[PDB]
Amino acid sequence: ISIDPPCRFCYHRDGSGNCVYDAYGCGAV
């Protein structure tokens, strides 16, 4: 089965279950 795409640009699923800007480093490091 195909998996859904990643979160928004530089985002990620948090504990609440929503996408949020990776303030810990979205690859801009």
Side-chain angles (χ1 to χ4, degrees), residues 2-26:
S2 173
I3 311 90
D4 44 68
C7 271
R8 275 175 152 280
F9 177 60
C10 271
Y11 273 45
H12 68 240
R13 205 191 74 190
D14 74 297
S16 203
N18 270 310
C19 304
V20 293
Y21 175 74
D22 205 354
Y24 270 61
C26 74

